[PDB]
């Protein structure tokens with residue numbers, strides 16, 4: 001369920017004019033710095049020459065359950081691995097990406113407890129900790145396009161250390177010298193990459209940091225490495241923790257579930273009741289689109305959670321039903337003017353709306369009621385904001401309401417009205 005997304009120049013011909021980086025995060029599902037950094041990179045950066053291939057979350061099932069690894073430690077599965085392991089197919093996908101001839105370098109992002117120090121200081125600051133370090137398996141990889149791992153790492157670290165938020169967050173180099181006997185790292189992703197003659201690096205941001213600070217450091221590491229590779233790029237924001245926080249918590253983010261209208265990710269009520277979902281369909285098979293890359297659905301008891309990374313955006317209490325795709329549009333009067341409103345759209349209303357009757361279709365405006373009928377048809381009513389019971393809104397702001405259409409016990413679609 002992981003996916004690779006390309007960040008490429010507009011002109012295909014420019015792809016071969018600078019190096020190619022494979023950027024990977026989310027091998028552990030409870031390390032949101034890494035997968036929020038890949039998400040922001042995908043949403044807000046442009047690559048002008050060369051290519052950056054991104055797997056924003058390697059372990060998506062585990063991310064959805066805020067779990068380090070549902071099927072074990074995915075980053076110990078790159079050497080010996082039983083074909084029956086549930087993640088065996090995913091590991092082969094990742095290995096195939098790493099080993100492609102077009103890839104020159106690999107950057108793997110993680111979050112880790114404490115702060116790495118080369119010497120022991122205390123329980124939080126010591127050599128067994130991984131927070132805020134930039135990691136190589138060895139100094140050099142003979143046969144790579146860019147064999148000088150140590151020089152790249154030192155220069156990337158220098159770049160990150162020019163932008164520290166507090167001196168305790170200073171980055172240090174960790175060279176695990178993996179081939180010489182680090183049996184754990186011999187099973188990990190970056191060692192596999194070195195063995196395919198790729199330049200491979202890992203960045204670990206401290207779990208002691210708030211998310212926006214972790215993401216800040218991961219973005220510094222990405223930029224530092226891109227600069228070393230001479231992959232030119234732009235971003236549409238200033239790289240500081242306040243801007244990172246604003247971009248993670250962006251009110252323009254949305255999720256489109258199945259053929260339903262887009263809903264905002266943020267400021268939803270915590271529970272959406274009687275929420276139509278296609279019947280006879282496993283939750284991971286329900287289509288979901290977003291302008292973010294780390295959104296999904298997951299079952300929890302009798303609810304379906306909408307997830308944005310590790311963040312719970314709402315709890316759907318599903319109404320499983322056949323989705324009949326026959327209805328494409330509905331005639332509505334909006335602020336006195338008829339228009340044909342597409343099923344699955346959001347229509348802004350300043351004053352009022354009225355749904356024209358349809359022969360075999362009933363409309364239920366959720367939050368509007370004329371009687372206590374259990375299958376209402378609310379076509380033919382002129383409806384204003386003041387007619388709604390506000391607690392039925394999708395949003396905490398009480399402006400967005402669902403209109404659901406039904407045809408003979410099947411669901412014919414939804415339109416949202418947004419009062420502006």
Ligand SMILES: N[C@H](CCC[C@H](N)C(=O)O)C(=O)O
Nearest residue numbers: 075108130185188189190202
């Ligand atoms: N804290 C991570 C570091 C892995 C660093 C590098 N070997 C990689 O594969 O990215 C781990 O213990 O899996």
